[PDB]
Amino acid sequence: NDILSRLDPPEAEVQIDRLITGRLQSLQTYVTQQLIRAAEIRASANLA
C-alpha cells in the first residue's frame, strides 16, 4: 500500500514485480520444505 500510494504506476509496477518475485521464491522454498518434511513424515507413518 505504501508503494502504491507513493510511487507513480510505471515504477510501482517494477517494485511490485520485484516484491512478488521475492515473495514467490519464499513461497516455493516453504512449499518444497513442506514437501520434503511430508515425505519424511509419511515414511515415519508407514513405519509406524
Binding site: 507513480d8 504506476p9 510505471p10 509496477e13
Partner: protein, 48 residues
Amino acid sequence: SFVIRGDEVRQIAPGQTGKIADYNYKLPDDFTGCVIAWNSNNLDSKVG
C-alpha cells in the same frame, strides 16, 4: 496529429506526468507504437 508547445514534447510517452499528458492526451503504459515530432515555428506562428 496535433501541434503542441516546445516544452510539451516529452509529455507524450508512456507514464509521463504533465498538463498535456493528464488533461489533453494520455498514452498507455503498454503502448506499442511511435511518436514523431518536428519544429514548425515558420508555419504555425503569426507575426503577432
